[PDB]
Symmetry: C3
Subunit: 376 residues, 3 copies
C-alpha cells in the first residue's frame, strides 16, 4: 500500500560505487570551482550560464546548510575545518564507502586515498581506469607486443595491487558500438597512436581490441567493469553513447561471468534498465544526472526502473572535487527513492525496504566484495 | 473539467487485439512459470533477478486476489478449477474477445481456439503470423518460385481460412528499416536460408521482399497487419526497432489502404504516436510494457498520446500463458486511462467516454471487423 | 520553497521569437482550417482523425472563450471583427512582439507585416529563411558561381533589409547531420538541382555547403540562426532530426560567435537542453509541441530543463494561420512555467521570477536585439 519511507531512507547507508577525487579545501576561488564542477561544460563555456542551471544552486544550498561559518559560507578552509566540513556532509547522508576512479584528476587534487579516507571519515578504495593505464604504458614501449604484455600484466595484477574494480571511458573517446577487432588492426592503431605524439588514447580499433581482450582477465579476478554511458562533455559524441550499441559485447561476456556496470546512463536510462532485465551480471546507476540534473532525479529514477530488477540499479554520485557534489547526489537520490517506493503497488513495506537497501549499498557491497565495510 | 471516470472505466469492455496462447493449468511449477513469463529474459537469466522486478509481484498479487483456494494460491488447477479461475479474471476486467497470434507457442500450450474460448468464456480468433508460415512452407520446397507461390497463396487464403489479421515479427529477426528488395536478392536469401539448415527465417532481403509483396494481398482482404515494435528479448536488436525506420514502408502502403498496427512500441511510443498523427491507417498499442513494466503504464500512456489521435491507440495485453498476465495488463491500462482522462482539459465528459470506448474496444472492433462480438 | 507564481506568470510579456503568418479572417471554412492547422498531417490525412487529437479541441476551447459572437463562435470575420478578435487573444496572453519566418506561406495569407502588426496590435518583424531565398535565386542563374554570388550577397544584406534573424529548414529536406562539403560537390548539387526542374531545394551537399558558408556572414551581422529540429511532416525523416547530429557544426561555429536556436526539438528536447549546457550561444524552444501536443507541454518543459540553463530556453509558439494557435501555445507554456517553478527547490522567489522573465521575453530580446519593443 501507501507507506512513508522518509525516516527509513534517512538512515540507509550509501556505498558510492563510482566517484572521484576531492580537491584541496584551501583553494581560494571556491564559489567558481563549485560552479565549474557543477557542469560538464569546459573552461571556455560562460560561467554565468553555468550559474543559471539548477545544479549550481543546489550546491550553494548545501554549502549554506553545512557551512562552518554561516557568515562566510563560501570561504576556503584549512585542513581541520575542511575535514569537519566533509565529515558533516558525508555523515549527514550516511555515506559508508567511496570507490574512486583514480583516472580522473581534478586540478589541485587530493590524490592519496588514505588522506581522502581521513578527510571524509569512511573507507576509500580505487577503481582501475583502463585507458589511462594504457596511455601510461604506451609511453614506455615502441611496439604493440611489448606494450600489450606490460599493460595486460598490469591489468591482471590490479586485484593484487588493491584495486576493487575496473573502468572504461570508451564512451568519451570512441563510443559504445563495441565490435571485435583483429590483432592486425589493433597493432596498426597502436602504431598510429605512437606516431601521432598525442598521449590521449582515441583509437577505436585499439580500444575495442583492449576491451574484448581484458574481459577474461577481469572475470578471472571477479571484479566489476564499469563503463561511462551517456551524459558527457562537448567532445563526447552522445549519439554513440546509447548502451544498446554494447549488445554484442554484453552477449560475448556477461554469460561468461563479466560483471558490467553502466554508469550515469542518461538520457539512455530506459535502455540501461531494459538491458538489466535481459542480461545477467548487468548493473547500472543514474549518477551525474542525479546531482548535475537535480530536478530530473525522481522522474529519471522512475523511468530507469520501469523494466529493471530493483537488484540491478545502484547508488553512485559520480562526484568530484567538493563534498557538496556528493551531498547533492545523495539528497536527490534518497528523495527519488522515497517518492518512488511510498506509493509503489503490489509489494509490502518489508520488500520496499529490502529493495532500498539493495540499491543504496547492499548490491554494490556484494558486487565489489565490500561486505565488511558495510557492517553496522 | 475534472471528472471521475473510475466507475465508467471499470465497466468498459476490452477487445484484446493482440495476445497469445494460454498453457495447461495442470502444469506443476506454476510460481516459476509465472516468473518466467513475467519477463522477456531467457531461461539462462537468473530467476531470482526476474523475481526482483515489479511485474512478478503484480502477477502474484493477482493470483492471490482471484485464487480458487486462498490457502494454496499458487496451486496447479484441474480443468474445472482452471476454467473458473480464468472466468474470474477475464470477467473482472470485462474482456470480450481475444485475437491470438498463433505463431508463438508456449511450452505445454492450449492450442485449440475453441478450447481456449471455453476456458476464458469469450470468443477467441486467430492472427496469421507471416514468418512462421513462411518457415513451414520453406520446408516443403527446394526453390524460391515454388515456395513463394505456395506461401503467397496461403496468405491470400487467410481470411477464407478464418484468420482476422496478420502479424510480422520482423523486428525480432532483422529490425524495422524496411526497404524494397529485388527478386534476385530475395531468391538468393531464400537459397542461403534453405542451405543453412536453420528453420528460423532471419534473411533481411527475404523478409523485406515478403513484407512489400504481401501488402497488396493483405489490403485486398481488408485485414490489419501487426508489427512487433520495440521491447524484445536479448537476441532482438532494440536499436533497429525504432518505428521511424518504417517510414518508407508506411509511405508505400498506408495511402493504398494497408492498416498497420504497431505493437508494444516502448521505448519508442512517442515515435509511434507521432506516426499515428501523420499517416493514415496507422494504429498502435503499449502492450507488453503495460503488464511487464507495470509502474510505467500511466506515464507511458500519457507520453504515447501527446500527439496521437485518441482514435489510433488500442488496448492489448500481449499476454500469454496465464490469466494473471492478461489481468495485470488490463488493470494497469484501465488505471492509466482514469489517471489520464480525469483531468484532461478542453473536452467534456462525453468526449472522454467516447475516447475511452474507442481505445478499449471500439476502434479494434472496427479495424478487425469484430463488431458483432462487442455487442452488449 | 513553494511559491504561487500564477498571478506573476499571467502578467509576464511574451516575445514570440519564431512564428508564422496569419490568414485572412474572411476565409469561409474556419472550423476546417483550424483543424487542418492543428496538425502537421497533410491534406490527404483524414480530417476526422485530426479532430480526434487534443490540439483541435484546445483550439475550439479558445475560439469559444474569446468569440466575438457567442452564438456563432466559428464564424468567419470581417476586418474590424478579426482585428478585435486577434487583439483579445494576443492581449490576454501579453504577447509583445512576433518574429515571423516569412518562408512559410499558408493559403490565403496576410503577407504584409505592417498589416499583421495592425491586426494583432504589436510589432512584427521578419526572419530570413535561407532555403526559400536560395530557391528563388536559383531560378535567376544557370551556374553555381553566379547563383552563389547573388544569394550570398542577399544573405549579407539581410540586416540592412530589416530582417532580424535567419532560419534553416534543413531538417525537413536533408536532416541535421551537417558535415562540411567541398565546392566541387556543392556545385554538382546545384547543377543536378537546376537540371531536375524541381524548385524545392533538397540537395544535402548544397544545403550543408550553404550552412557552413553562410555562418560567417550571419556572425558578422550578429543575428541568430534558427533551425527546425524534430516534429515535422510525413515527408520529414524524424530519425535525422536528432540535434546531437549537429555537433560538428556547433563545434565549428558557436565558439566563433554564431547564435544558434533549436526550434521545437521534440522528441529530442532532452538532447537540445543537454547541448545548451555544453555549447556557448546555443538556445532552444519547445514550440509546436507546446500547442499541437498540448497535454505534453508541462512534462516536456520539465524534461527539457533537466540540464539546460534556464537562460537558454525560449518561448515560441511556432503558430500560423489563426490566433487560437498562438493563444494555445501561450496558455500551455505559461501553465508549464507555473507548474515547474512553484515547487522548484534551492532558489528563491526572485530567482524564479528572473528565470521566467528570461524565458518568456528577456533572453529573446537580447538575442534578437529587440530590447526597445519589450520596454514596459
Ligand atoms: Zn562517467
Ligand atoms: Zn565518473
Ligand atoms: Zn511482440
Ligand atoms: Zn505478441
Ligand atoms: Zn519548424
Ligand atoms: Zn516554424
Amino acid at each position: 500500500g501507501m507507506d512513508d519511507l522518509s525516516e527509513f531512507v534517512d538512515q540507509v547507508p550509501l556505498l558510492d560505487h563510482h566517484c572521484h577525487f576531492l580537491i584541496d579545501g584551501k583553494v581560494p576561488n571556491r564559489d567558481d570551482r563549485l560552479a565549474q564542477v557543477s557542469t560538464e561544460a569546459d573552461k571556455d563555456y560562460p560561467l554565468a550560464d553555468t550559474k543559471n542551471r539548477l545544479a549550481y544552486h543546489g550546491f550553494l544550498a548545501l554549502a549554506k546548510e553545512f557551512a562552518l561559518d554561516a557568515n562566510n559560507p563560501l570561504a576556503a578552509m584549512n585542513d581541520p575545518g575542511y575535514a569537519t566540513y566533509n565529515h558533516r556532509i558525508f555523515g549527514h547522508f550516511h555515506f559508508k564507502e567511496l570507490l574512486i576512479d583514480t583516472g580522473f584528476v581534478p586540478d589541485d587534487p587530493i590524490l592519496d586515498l588514505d588522506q581522502t579516507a581521513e578527510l571524509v571519515g569512511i573507507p576509500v578504495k580505487a577503481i582501475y581506469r583502463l585507458e589511462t593505464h594504457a596511455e601510461d604504458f604506451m609511453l614506455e614501449h615502441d611496439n604493440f607486443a611489448a606494450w600489450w604484455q606490460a599493460f595486460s600484466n598490469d591489468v591482471k595484477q590490479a586485484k593484487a595491487h588493491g584495486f576493487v574494480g575496473f573502468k572504461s571511458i570508451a564512451a568519451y573517446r570512441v563510443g559504445l558500438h563495441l565490435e571485435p577487432v583483429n590483432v592486425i588492426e589493433a597493432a596498426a592503431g597502436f602504431d598510429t597512436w605512437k606516431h601521432s605524439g598525442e598521449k590521449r588514447l582515441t583509437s577505436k580499433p585499439l580500444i575495442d581490441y583492449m576491451l574484448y581482450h581484458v574481459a577474461p582477465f577481469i572475470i578471472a579476478q571477479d571484479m566489476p567493469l564499469q563503463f561511462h554511458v551517456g551524459y558527457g562533455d562537448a567532445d563526447t559524441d552522445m549519439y554513440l553513447g546509447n548502451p544498446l550499441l554494447m549488445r554484442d559485447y554484453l552477449k560475448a561476456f556477461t554469460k561468461k561471468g563479466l560483471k558490467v556496470v553502466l554508469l550515469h546512463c542518461y538520457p539512455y536510462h530506459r535502455e540501461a534498465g531494459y538491458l538489466a532485465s535481459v542480461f545477467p551480471n548487468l548493473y547500472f546507476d543514474i549518477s551525474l544526472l542525479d546531482n548535475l540534473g537535480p530536478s530530473g532525479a525522481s522522474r529519471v529514477f522512475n523511468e530507469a526502473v520501469e523494466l529493471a530488477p530493483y537488484t540491478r540499479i545502484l547508488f553512485a554520485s559520480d562526484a568530484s572535487t567538493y563534498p557538496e557534489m556528493y551531498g547533492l547526489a545523495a539528497r536527490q537520490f534518497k528523495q527519488a527513492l522515497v517518492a518512488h517506493f511510498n506509493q509503489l503497488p503490489f509489494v509490502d513495506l518489508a520488500q520496499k525496504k529490502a529493495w532500498i537497501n539493495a540499491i543504496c549499498w547492499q548490491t554494490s557491497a556484494k558486487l565489489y566484495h565490500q561486505e565488511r565495510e558495510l557492517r553496522v
